[PDB]
């Protein structure tokens, strides 16, 4: 009876209307993209980059641990002795359409050469722009180094 | 036609309602070398940028990227990022342009790199 | 001028009223859904979902395309009236991703339908997809005509 | 103009009525039928019988829609490819000609004016005029109409009513009475304990 | 159990019903259909919108995961688990880790165990928020998903702050969890837990006693105990019928014994009961999250991985000690060997019992990896469940079964 | 100009200008109705809604409309082509057409007919044929199922729609829409409006209006989660635009009727502010706001449950009310509180 009375007076609809109006006048959490952005932690796995040492030399020494661990087989590497005898790659490709952005490669790298950076806004108009070669990856590292280095420092105590 | 651009478009530095909101609640934090202006409310609880020109999110440089995405507490004005001498200046996304990256063998390149893995004998 | 400013108006209307088919295949659809949720509110751009391809201008291929599914995706794309745009979202749709070497997977949705934008990630974040949608708008502004 | 208004409604109704009976598509017949009733309502307005003009549309908009439901419920299996027509058209023409000849010399009785049971008043609106006679002078017919409608109610239910007994049904009031407090409860399940 | 030939309470037999049924009303319900989750092709036979036959065609998201797993190491296969019931990825990772840990006889550190419970219950809320509020959208309520997915957004940020990914964490590892949680993350999880019950009340105020909501769910999809045993039901699919079965209690794993939570059960076993059970489970998971954060703070500092011969060392050790560098090199290329044997390791995943049947043969790669998805068994019963209902009830029944096709198809 | 406005031409131009005023108001309001509808759902949903296309998104409906004008018309191969294009035409045309008898102020009505209530009923019910014929003419299963649901919807809300307003005619003594407003004039502002003596019928009319407009909780002919787009699944570009235009115009008509029949039309709620078309528009947009809020907070009925409401709840209640009102009006209970006729 009490439940029958409340349904006759449309109480369930009135409660909904009141709840709707409370939300109506409340602050909106919406981000004003592209002016306002979502939060990214230092661990965020974004676009790949190849890093250099503070002395300007490449960090990668063609050990191929990243190519071996890659669950998606997204990495392809060829190496030779450089002209000075250094152990360096001649090809370092990442197929970004195969990659699952798992971050295993940066875990496997013993010299912090390959990392997943903070950048995530690099959508392309053609598919082949996502076949990253060595120079593209190194260019990413030279442009994003300052933020990448700071993120490595922030997460070092947990790695 | 300057005002109309502001009235009718949403990809030119800000909409009219973004500008009003910034004036009401915005507190300037600094500027980058492109002329993008950074703001905050609540002492950095909310952080946003007003673009100088086309509002393209890939224009935000690594200098400000960490602050704008709340990775770092303090703006680069107060806590500048250390830069190595071999670093290169930031570039936005170039995908729809002629500066877009393409693989060496791409037909866009107009001189695609020829590939082989053996040397052929040449008759004398 | 008349014709370029006419195209600008057409491109303005098409960018501001970009309706996308309710079509999600896999875990890329979860992030696509978050893009329409309050934190990002994709609909505030005028980019609203439409259940029927007859009312859709944009197809977001959000997830793995299997061989068994490929004819169905092509059919609903074929039933989109023109202009129609396609965004490839995530590794599976972009190139096959984690299942690239599988016997039952299409190695990239561009083997079935033409693609306008590729969004990288597995999944791309809700914000990355929103960026990709705005890159499509730049592409239409740059090259849009009455045909598309 | 009145001449233009008459022929618009007159031609529309007569053409629509013809299309109802000779067309092969039953759904097209349904749409021609509603056009005939709308056209006849237009003629009624021209004559100042506005209430029955509007009542006619209200009634037959719903009734014609019901006819559409039965057309699709009993739709023939040969929709894709959906007589003595010559002789029938001859008898129809003969009947129409006879009626036209009878209407050529139409004249009411010279007593017709004095015998009117409900003379029309210019100052009274049509709906009010009908209401003044419908329920008092014609009260006996009014009550019989109610019984005519009751017979239709009884007949339709008597003839056709049946219910599937093999489908799942819910009592709406019992759905609304379901108490969440009674229908769900929390259990303290100890570790290692099954059903 | 066959209603195609209509049966009437007056015993009448129509002339057409006598003829053999050759021209039936068959309709493709999905894959491109808002209620079909994108990849369900359900062929429905309708009779005046009564569902007389439902024929789910699945495999439109079959990607050959179990074949792909046979040519990868155990570590390389961990991300495949994320992408089965991808609404709550770490919960699926847990079964893979448990199976490997059982075969190798490995004990994971205490802190890793607490973190696994913490993020498993985050996953349960991530799933139940999606299930309940999109289930509401299936019966026409537009608003609930918007409120619920804002709370999901916050939980996905907790995912990202732990592992760097919002969805596909790859965070649970054989031997524990990859990384430790920042202290400020534990503060934020505690702060979120204090607000969350308010959203549950708001969703409850909007839906629970709404007469329309009740008329769309009450007495729909009734499941009896006997039905549950026909179709391999697990999770809320059995608890909604009143069977207080929950693997965290009946067959405890990790450290669930020492947590305080209760098992909600239903009395009528219909869509309304299972909705109430899921709402109640969300409250219980929030309480577990609160206890786990308190235990983690009270814990002494320790490792999150077992190290040894199963997991790589820490990066600082890898760059200093010869043994650590070797173990890093070998475990990221070859990986650990798993002794020959076969195990079935099951967890109470948010959608029901999820299990891995792992056949190891002593090498670094699985011989066979069979993935047992709860949704596979639940979806199979839709023909029995939907028979006799109307077409409008179908989306509600799809919702109540809690189907994600990453795990149905694998 | 006097020599002009008295002629047939000045008479013919007067009607055309009056017709353009109605189309301008109804179509102009349509720009802000679609915008306002979406903004209200968004606000209840902790989000913004359209806010980038123009200032605060205020040009969004122009963008949507233009997009459809340059969108291809796809004609299904198996569709009945004449009935396919007739259905959207009827849907938009008849909804707009019903406004010819709507008064907005004293003397601001294009057609002041004695049977205005019945004409509204005739035109709105005939508008349903657009949905029924649109679904059937597409010749595909989802639009076909929606076509039958549309017929079911008509049977559900119309059986008691006449009875719901018979009380207002009894109190007024007229079906003229302007007369109904004048019957609500008095010395106590809003306390003279019919919402008070006929409080139960305000609820029943509002609910019936939602069903007549295919609006939640009765959005059954579209019902995305069950039928993809229902009767509109096979429609694109401007033919589809006409169905949406008709849906909002029909909604706007119900907002007008709610305000005319129960809230005094253009009369002032307070004695000291003047009566005028501003009060009519304010009340119309309050009721539109109620339409939008309902969409944001209710789920969807099954269409057999809608039929239960019409026949087992609304029909007995409205019938009982008519008898009760007749007794109260006949005997002038409370001094003619229900007998407003002279
Ligand atoms: C002049 C005044 C005329 C107005 C009344 C019209 C006549 C209706 C009577 C027919 C009812 C009937 O056959 O059922 C009798 C009902 C038994 O019906 P049943 O066949 O056993 O099935 C029950 C219904 O199916 C079970 O109900 P349901 O699941 O179909 O849901 C409908 C629900 C909804 O109930 C309603 O909303 C009906 C309320 C009745 C309104 C009529 C008076 C209004 C007065 C004006 C006030 C203004 C409004 C504020 O109504 C009921 O619960 C049924 C109660 C019977 C209504 C009696 C009146 O009880 C009786 O035996 C009483 C007979 C006398
Ligand atoms: C006859 C009446 C019936 C209804 C009229 C017809 C319907 C017209 C269609 C338009 C509907 C407009 C919906 C507006 C909803 C706006 C949001 C709302 O309700 O308030 C919620 C918001 C608060 O959130 P915030 O912006 O994050 O606030 C942070 C900041 N510090 C602040 O306080 O802000 O707070 C604000 O948004 C504050 C600003 C409110 C803006 C006031 C103008 C609204 C238009 C009213 C038109 C009247 C006609
Ligand atoms: C004070 C309340 C008014 C009481 C007048 C009597 C109304 C009778 C209506 C009725 O019983 O049927 C309900 C009908 C039928 O519902 P039902 O299926 O419960 O059937 C009614 C059965 N009884 C009454 C016995 C429980 O409701 C509907 O059809 C759905 C309502 C549509 C949405 C309404 C939204 C209104 C929200 C705004 C409220 C707050 C504004 C500020
Ligand atoms: C011209 C209208 C002017 C409206 C703007 C008023 C200034 C508001 C400033 C403010 O603080 O508003 C808060 C909120 C923010 O809105 P927004 O800019 O979208 O959010 C950006 C967040 N970074 O602002 C808002 O929510 C503002 C929303 C504006 C809505 C305006 C509606 C205009 C009319 C709608 C249809 C009216 C129908 C006709 C009714 C007739 C009868 C009354
Ligand atoms: C209230 C009534 C509203 C009526 C409908 C309004 C919508 C119709 C007008 C379209 C909006 C303007 C438009 O199309 O903008 C295009 C152009 C942008 O110019 P810009 O961004 O500098 O160029 C980019 C080149 N790819 O535009 C401009 O820069 C603005 C120039 C004015 C154009 C006015 C329309 C003629
Ligand atoms: C706010 C906008 C104004 C609200 C009122 C809208 C009224 C429009 C319907 C006009 C009705 C009409 O037919 O007007 C006739 C009236 C006198 O005509 P007369 O020949 O004396 O009598 C007819 C005899 N049967 O004529 C008159 O007295 C003048 C009629 C008013 C003309 C002004 C309205 C023009 C339309 C404005 C469009 C913009 C509004 C939409 C914007 C969005 C609103 C939210
Ligand atoms: C503040 C922003 C204003 C923007 C424009 C507002 C448009 C208003 C539409 C026309 C007026 C409608 C009035 C509806 C009746 C109010 C209902 C109500 O307040 O319920 C109590 C309701 C209780 O809800 P509860 O908190 O869940 O109990 O009040 C509130 O929660 C606050 C809402 C007050 C709204 C008044 C301002 C209009 C917006
Ligand atoms: C022909 C054999 C010998 C008989 C000689 C008498 C000739 C009359 C034969 C009548 C048969 C033809 C059918 C038409 C009936 C004419 C009636 C008549 O003349 O009445 C006087 C009458 C004169 O009007 P009055 O002066 O107002 O009485 O004739 C008319 O003008 C009547 C007009 C009829 C309207 C036709 C509407 C068509 C609708 C669209 C159909 C498609
Ligand atoms: C926006 C649409 C404007 C619609 C026309 C406005 C006048 C409404 C009709 C009316 O008052 O009757 C004509 C009515 C007839 O003449 P009257 O008897 O002198 O008022 O008014 C006019 O003469 C028209 C004056 C307004 C012209 C505005 C056209 C632009
Ligand atoms: C009062 C009645 C007003 C008009 C009611 C609409 C029904 C009449 C239109 C039926 C048109 C059938 C054409 C079918 C066909 O194959 O032509 C498509 C026809 C041919 O394509 P087009 O050469 O690009 O026009 O497509 C259309 O755009 C037809 C538009 C119909 C316009 C009248 C509405
Ligand atoms: C169904 C719900 C019924 C609610 C009962 C309301 C009782 C009103 C009795 C009015 C008595 C009277 O003097 O009638 C003639 C009286 C004639 O006034 P006049 O038209 O200004 O000459 O009735 C009216 O038309 C206006 C009466 C307005 C006073 C209503 C007071 C209600 C206050 C409570 C509101 C909540
Ligand atoms: S992120 Fe994972 S899938 Fe991508 S290249 Fe690195 S290891 Fe391979
Ligand atoms: S990037 Fe690192 S792991 Fe990969 S080859 Fe170079 S040094 Fe080795
Ligand atoms: S790309 Fe990654 S997130 Fe997207 S559907 Fe494929 S596996 Fe899922
Ligand atoms: Ca049958």
- 3-state SS string over A71-119? CCCCEEEEEEECCCCCEEEEEEEEECCCCCCCCHHHHHCCCCCEEECCC
Question: With contacts defined as CB-CB under 8 Å, which chain C residues touch E34?
Answer: 22, 51
- The three-class DSSP label of residue E46 is strand
What's the A10 CA to ligand 11 centre distance in angstroms?
25
The helix/strand/coil state of E305 is strand
Side-chain-side CA neighbours of E139 within 13 Å: the count stands at 31
- Strand partners for A80: A88
Contact A147 B81 (CB under 8 A): yes
* Cα angle value C132/C138/C9 (rounded, 5°): 135
CB A91 within 8 A of CB B65: no
Using an 8 Å CB-CB cutoff, list residues of chain C that contact chain B: 12, 16, 45, 131, 134-135, 137-139, 141-142
Residue C1: CB atoms within 10 Å: 7
Protein residue with its CA nearest to atom 32 in ligand 6: F21
- What 3-state DSSP class applies to D22? helix
Nearest to B88 by CA among A145, F261, F25, F37: A145
Are residues A144 and A119 in contact, defined by beta-carbon separation less than 8 angstroms? yes
Write out the H or E segment, with its range, that includes residue F239: helix F237-262
Q: Which of A98, A40, A141 is nearest to C118 (CA)?
A: A98
Are E121 and E285 spatial neighbours (Cβ–Cβ below 8 Å)? yes
Closest Cα partner for F43 from F300, F297, F299, F298?
Answer: F297
Q: Mutate which of F21, F106, F114, F248 to test ligand 6's pocket (most atoms within 8 Å of Cβ)?
A: F21
As a whole number of angstroms, the distance between CA A135 and CA A105 comes to: 18
* Eight-class DSSP state of F192: G
**DSSP string over B52-101:** SSB--GGG--HHHHHHHTTSSSS-TTTSPPP--TT--------TTSTT--
Q: Give the three-class secondary structure for A36.
A: strand
- Burial of E211-242, coded b for 16+ CB within 10 Å and e otherwise, reads bbbbbbbbbbbbbeeebbeebbbbbbbbbbbb
Structure token pair of residue E156:
């996905």
CB atoms within 10 A of CB D173: 10
- Output the CA D7–ligand 8 centroid distance in Å: 14
CB nearest F48 (choices: A25, A26, A28): A28
Residue E215: which of F215, A20, A11, F304 has the closest Cα? F304
CA gap F219, F227 in Å, rounded: 11
For ligand 5, whether the C-beta of C138 sits within 6 Å is no
How far does C75 lie from chain A, in Å, by closest CA? 23
Which residue, judged by its Cα, is nearest atom 26 of ligand 9?
Answer: F17
- Asked if the Cβ–Cβ distance from F125 to D62 is below 8 Å, we say yes
Q: How far apart are CA F263 and CA E281, in angstroms?
A: 48
E268/D180 touch (CB, cutoff 8 Å), yes or no:
no
Residue in the structure block whose two tokens are 């506005």: D50
Residues of B within 8 A of C45 (CB-CB) are 10
Long-range contact set of residues A14-18: C-beta below 8 Å, sequence gap at least 24: A15/E205, A15/E209, A16/E205, A16/E206, A16/E210, A16/F297, A16/F298, A17/F293, A17/F297
Q: Which long-range contacts (CB under 8 A, 24 or more apart) does E240-245 make?
A: E240/E265, E240/E266, E240/E269, E240/E270, E240/E273, E240/E274, E240/E277, E241/E265, E241/E266, E241/E269, E241/E273, E242/E266, E242/E267, E242/E269, E243/D195, E244/D187, E244/D189, E244/D195, E245/D194, E245/D195
Distance (Å) from CA F312 to ligand 1 centroid: 7
CA D122 to each of CA C49, D112, D129, F111: distance values in angstroms, whole numbers, following the listed order: 59, 19, 10, 20
Atom of ligand 5 nearest to the CA of C12: 14
CA-based nearest residue to F137, from F198, F87, F176: F87
Q: Can you read off the two tokens belonging to residue D138? A: 């014609």
CB C24 within 8 A of CB C63: yes
Residues E346 and E247 sit within 8 Å (Cβ to Cβ)? yes
For chains C and A, having 3+ Cβ pairs within 8 Å is answered yes
- Note whether E273 and E218 are within 8 A (CB): no
Residues of E in contact with D176 (CB under 8 A): 211, 214-215, 218
DSSP 8-state secondary structure symbol assigned to residue D121: -
Quick one: tokens of B17? 């309602």
Both tokens assigned to A138: 């190194």
Place of tokens 């063998």: B105
- Give me the half-sphere count of Cα atoms (radius 13 Å) on the Cβ side of residue F84: 19
Q: Among E20, E11, E37, which Cα is nearest to E405's?
A: E37
Contacts of D177 in chain A (CB under 8 A): 3
d(CA D50, CA D130): 11
**The tokens of D163 are what?**
């219910």
Looking at ligand 12, which residue's alpha carbon is closest to its atom 2?
A102
Resolution in Å, one decimal place: 2.3
Q: Could you tell me which residues are beta bridge partners of residue E172? A: E177
Contacting chains of A (3 CB pairs or more, <8 Å) are B, C, D, E, F
* CB-CB neighbours of F276 under 10 Å: 15
Specify binding-site residues of C for [4Fe-4S] cluster: 27-28, 92, 122
**Measuring from atom 26 of ligand 4, which residue has the nearest CA?**
F48
For helices D26-46 and D2-22, angle between their N-to-C axes, nearest 10 degrees: 160
By CB atoms closer than 10 A (0-12, 13-18, 19+), residue B98 is: exposed
**Ion ligand 15 — residues with CB under 5 Å?**
E 4, 6, 47
Q: Cα dist. E189→E50, E287, E402, F79 in Å? A: 47, 12, 26, 57
Which one of F2, F13, F17 would you pick to mutate in the ligand 9 pocket, going by the greatest count of ligand atoms within 8 A of its CB? F17
- Whether the CB of A149 is below 8 Å from some CB of chain E: the reply is no
Q: Do E164 and A19 touch (CB under 8 A)?
A: no
Q: Does D181 touch chain E (CB under 8 A)?
A: no
Cβ of D24 under 8 Å from any chain E Cβ?
A: no
Ligand 7 centre from D95 Cα, in Å? 71
Touching C (3+ Cβ pairs <8 A), the chains are: A, B, E, F
Q: Which residues of A define the annotated binding site for [4Fe-4S] cluster? A: 60, 63, 66, 70, 99, 102, 105, 109
Supply B55's token pair. 């509002």
Cis geometry, peptide bond prior to residue F217 (ω within 30 degrees of 0): yes
Nearest CA in chain F to E134: F225
- Give the contacts of A133 (CB within 8 A, at least 6 positions apart): A91, A92, A93, B103, B104
| Protein residue with least CA distance to atom 21, ligand 10 | F73
Ligand 2 centre distance from Cα of residue F48 (Å)? 9
Partner-chain residue, chosen from C12, C16, C135, that has the shortest CB–CB distance to B95? C135
Alpha-carbon Rg for chain E, nearest whole angstrom, is 23
Q: Are F329 and F171 in contact (CB under 8 A)?
A: yes
Binding site membership of F203 for ligand 3 (Cβ less than 6 Å): yes
- The 10 Å Cβ neighbour count of residue E309 is 13
Q: Which residues' Cβ are closer than 6 Å to ligand 14?
A: C 26-28, 63-64, 90-92, 97-98, 122-123; E 83
Angle at E48 between CA E44 and CA E50, to 5 degrees: 50
Say how far apart CA F33 and CA F91 lie, in whole Å: 18
Residues at the binding site of C are 27-28, 92, 122
Chain B hits for C12, Cβ within 8 Å: 8-9
Cβ of F67 and C79 within 8 Å?
no
Q: Structure tokens of E404?
A: 């994600």
Q: Which residue is it, tokens 């939980």? A: E155
Cβ(A24) to ligand 2 under 6 A?
yes
Kindly report the backbone phi and psi dihedral angles of residue E354, in degrees, each rounded to the nearest multiple of 5, phi listed first.
-105, 135
- DSSP H or E stretch at residue B10: none
Contacts of A69 (CB under 8 A, 6+ apart): A104, A105, A107, A108, E75, E76, E332, E333
Chain centroid to Cα E251, Å, comes to 18
Which residue has a Cα nearest atom 40 of ligand 2? Answer: A25
Token pair in block for residue F8: 């047939």
Contact D42, D7 (CB under 8 A): no
Taking each helix axis as running N to C, give the angle between helix D50-73 and helix F141-158, from 0 to 180 degrees, rounded to the nearest 10.
140
Chain F positions touching B17 (Cβ under 8 A) are 51, 55-56
Whether the CB of F44 is below 8 Å from some CB of chain A: the reply is: yes
Q: What residues in chain B have their Cβ under 8 A from chain F's Cβ atoms?
A: 7-8, 10, 15-17
Q: How far apart are CA E118 and CA E126, in angstroms?
A: 12
Closest CA to F111 of F173, F217, F19, F197: F19
Q: Smallest Cβ distance to E215: which of D163, D175, D182?
A: D175
F181-212 as b/e: b if 16+ CB within 10 A: bebbeeeebeebbbbebbeebbebbbbbbbbb
CA of C25, closest atom in ligand 14: 5
């Amino acid at each position: 009876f009490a439940r029958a009375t409340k349904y006759f007076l449309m109480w369930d609809f009135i409660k909904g209307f009141g709840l709707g109006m409370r939300y109506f006048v409340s602050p909106k959490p919406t981000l004003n993209y592209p002016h306002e952005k979502g939060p990214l932690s230092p661990r965020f796995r974004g676009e790949h980059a190849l890093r250099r040492y503070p002395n300007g030399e490449e960090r990668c020494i063609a050990c191929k641990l990243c190519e071996a661990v890659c669950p998606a087989q997204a990495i392809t590497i060829d190496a030779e002795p450089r002209e000075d005898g250094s152990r360096r790659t001649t090809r370092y490709d990442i197929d970004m359409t195969k990659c699952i952005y798992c971050g295993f490669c940066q875990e496997a790298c013993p010299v912090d050469a390959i990392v997943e950076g903070p950048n995530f806004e690099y959508a392309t108009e053609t598919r082949e722009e996502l076949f990253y070669d060595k120079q593209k990856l190194l260019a990413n590292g030279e442009r994003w180094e300052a933020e990448i280095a700071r993120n490595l420092q922030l997460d070092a105590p947990y790695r | 036609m300057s005002f109309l651009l502001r009235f009718l478009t949403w990809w030119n530095s800000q909409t009219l309602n973004t500008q009003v909101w910034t004036k009401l609640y915005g507190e300037k934090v600094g500027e980058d070398d492109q002329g993008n202006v950074y703001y905050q409310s609540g002492g950095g609880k909310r952080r946003w940028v007003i673009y100088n020109g086309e509002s393209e999110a890939s224009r935000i440089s690594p200098e400000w990227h960490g602050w704008l995405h709340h990775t770092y507490k303090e703006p680069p004005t107060a806590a500048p990022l250390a830069h190595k001498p071999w670093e290169k200046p930031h570039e936005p996304n170039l995908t729809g342009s002629s500066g877009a990256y393409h693989p060496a063998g791409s037909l866009y390149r107009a001189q695609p790199v020829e590939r082989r893995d053996y040397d052929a004998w040449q008759p004398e | 001028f008349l014709l370029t400013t006419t195209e600008d108006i057409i491109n303005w209307a098409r960018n501001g009223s970009l309706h996308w088919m309710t079509f999600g295949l896999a875990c890329c659809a979860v992030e696509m859904m978050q893009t329409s949720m309050p934190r990002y509110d994709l609909e505030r751009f005028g980019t609203a979902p439409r259940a029927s391809p007859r009312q859709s201008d944009l197809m977001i291929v959000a997830g793995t395309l299997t061989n068994k599914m490929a004819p169905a995706l092509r059919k609903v794309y074929d039933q989109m009236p023109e202009p129609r745009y396609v965004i490839s979202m995530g590794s599976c749709a972009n190139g096959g991703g984690y299942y690239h070497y599988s016997y039952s997977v299409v190695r990239g949705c561009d083997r079935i339908v033409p693609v306008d934008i590729y969004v990288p990630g597995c999944p791309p974040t809700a914000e990355a997809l929103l960026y990709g949608i705005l890159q499509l708008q730049r592409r239409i502004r740059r090259t849009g005509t009455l045909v598309r | 103009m009145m001449t233009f208004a008459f022929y618009l409604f007159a031609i529309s109704a007569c053409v629509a009525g013809f299309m109802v009976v000779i067309g092969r598509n039953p759904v097209h017949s349904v749409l021609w039928l509603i056009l005939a009733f709308l056209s006849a309502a237009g003629l009624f307005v021209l004559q100042g019988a506005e209430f029955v003009a509007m009542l006619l549309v209200v009634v037959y908009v719903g009734a014609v829609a019901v006819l559409f439901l039965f057309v699709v419920m009993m739709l023939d299996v040969d929709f894709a490819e959906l007589r003595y027509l010559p002789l029938a058209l001859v008898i129809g023409v003969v009947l129409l000609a006879q009626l036209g000849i009878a209407f050529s010399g139409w004249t009411p009785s010279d007593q017709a004016e004095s015998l009117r049971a409900a003379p029309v008043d210019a100052a009274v609106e049509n709906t009010l005029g009908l209401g003044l006679v419908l329920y008092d002078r014609y009260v006996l017919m009014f009550q019989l109409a109610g019984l005519v409608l009751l017979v239709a109610m009884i007949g339709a239910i008597v003839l056709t009513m049946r219910h599937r007994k093999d489908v799942k049904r819910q009592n709406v009031l019992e759905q609304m009475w379901r108490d969440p407090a009674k229908t769900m409860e929390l259990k303290d399940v100890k570790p290692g304990q099954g059903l | 159990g066959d209603i195609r030939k209509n049966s009437y309470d007056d015993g009448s037999m129509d002339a057409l019903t006598g003829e053999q049924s050759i021209r039936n009303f068959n309709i493709n319900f999905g894959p491109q259909h808002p209620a079909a989750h994108g990849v369900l092709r359900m062929v429905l036979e309708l009779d005046g919108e009564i569902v007389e036959r439902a024929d789910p065609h699945i495999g439109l998201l079959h990607r050959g995961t179990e074949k792909l797993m046979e040519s990868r190491t155990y570590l390389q296969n961990l991300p495949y688990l994320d992408r089965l019931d991808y609404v709550a990825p770490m919960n699926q990772e847990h079964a893979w880790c448990l199976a490997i840990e059982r075969l190798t006889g490995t004990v994971i550190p205490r802190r890793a165990s607490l973190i696994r419970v913490l993020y498993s219950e985050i996953g349960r809320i991530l799933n139940h928020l999606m299930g309940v509020t999109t289930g509401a959208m299936d019966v026409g309520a537009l608003t609930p998903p918007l409120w619920g997915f804002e709370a999901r957004e916050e939980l996905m940020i907790f995912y990202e702050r732990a592992c760097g990914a919002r969805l596909h964490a790859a965070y649970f590892r054989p031997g524990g969890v990859h990384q430790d949680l920042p202290p400020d993350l534990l503060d934020d999880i505690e702060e979120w837990c204090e607000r969350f019950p308010k959203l549950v009340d708001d969703l409850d105020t909007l839906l629970t006693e709404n007469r329309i909501f009740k008329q769309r769910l009450v007495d729909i999809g009734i499941v009896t105990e006997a039905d549950a045993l026909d179709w391999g039901y697990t999770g809320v699919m059995v608890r909604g019928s009143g069977l207080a079965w929950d693997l965290r209690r009946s067959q405890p794993y990790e450290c669930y014994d020492e947590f305080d939570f209760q098992i909600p059960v239903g009395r009528n076993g219909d869509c309304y009961d299972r909705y109430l059970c899921r709402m109640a489970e969300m409250r219980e998971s929030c309480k577990i999250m609160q206890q786990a954060v308190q235990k983690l703070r009270a814990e002494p500092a320790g490792d999150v991985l077992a190290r040894g011969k199963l997991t790589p060392p820490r990066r600082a050790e890898m760059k200093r000690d010869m043994e650590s560098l070797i173990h890093h090199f070998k475990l990221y290329t070859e990986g650990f060997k798993v002794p020959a044997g076969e195990v079935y390791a099951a967890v109470e995943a948010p959608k029901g019992e999820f299990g891995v049947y792992l056949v190891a043969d002593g090498t670094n790669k699985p011989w066979r990896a069979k993935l047992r998805a709860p949704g596979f068994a639940h979806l199979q019963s839709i023909d029995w469940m939907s028979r006799g209902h109307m077409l409008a009830d179908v989306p509600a029944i799809i919702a109540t079964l809690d189907i994600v096709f990453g795990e149905v198809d694998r | 100009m006097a020599e002009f406005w008295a002629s047939p031409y000045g008479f013919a131009l007067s009607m055309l200008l009056q017709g353009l005023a109605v189309i301008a108001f109804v179509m102009g309001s349509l720009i802000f109705m679609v915008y306002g509808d979406r903004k209200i759902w968004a606000a209840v949903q902790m989000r913004r809604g359209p806010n980038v296309v123009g200032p605060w998104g205020l040009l969004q409906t122009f963008a949507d409309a233009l997009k459809y004008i340059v969108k291809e018309i796809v004609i299904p191969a198996g569709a009945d082509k004449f009935v396919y294009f007739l259905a959207p035409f009827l849907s938009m045309m008849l909804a707009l057409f019903a406004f010819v008898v709507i008064p907005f102020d004293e003397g601001w009505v294009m057609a002041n007919i004695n049977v205005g209530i019945l004409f509204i009923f005739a035109a709105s019910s005939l508008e349903v044929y657009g949905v029924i014929m649109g679904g059937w003419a597409s010749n595909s299963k989802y639009p076909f199922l929606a076509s039958l649901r549309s017929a079911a919807q008509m049977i559900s809300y119309e059986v008691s729609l006449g009875l719901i307003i018979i009380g207002i005619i009894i109190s007024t003594g007229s079906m003229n829409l302007t007369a109904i407003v004048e019957a609500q004039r008095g010395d106590y502002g809003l306390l003279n409006w019919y919402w008070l003596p006929h409080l139960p019928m305000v609820v029943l009319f509002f609910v019936s209006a939602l069903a007549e407009c295919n609006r939640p909780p009765f959005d059954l002919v579209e019902a995305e989660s069950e039928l993809v787009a229902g009767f509109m699944t096979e429609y694109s570009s401007t033919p589809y635009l006409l169905f949406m235009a008709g849906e909002y115009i029909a909604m706007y008509l119900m907002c007008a009727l709610l305000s005319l029949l129960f809230f005094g039309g253009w009369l002032s709620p307070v004695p000291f502010i003047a009566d005028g078309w501003w009060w009519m528009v304010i009340k119309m947009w309050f009721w539109f706001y109620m339409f939008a809020m309902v969409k944001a907070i209710v789920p969807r009925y099954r269409y057999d449950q809608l039929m239960r409401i019409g026949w087992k709840v609304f029909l007995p209640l409205s019938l009982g009310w008519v008898v009760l009102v007749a007794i109260l009006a006949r005997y002038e209970i409370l001094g003619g509180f229900w007998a407003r006729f002279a």
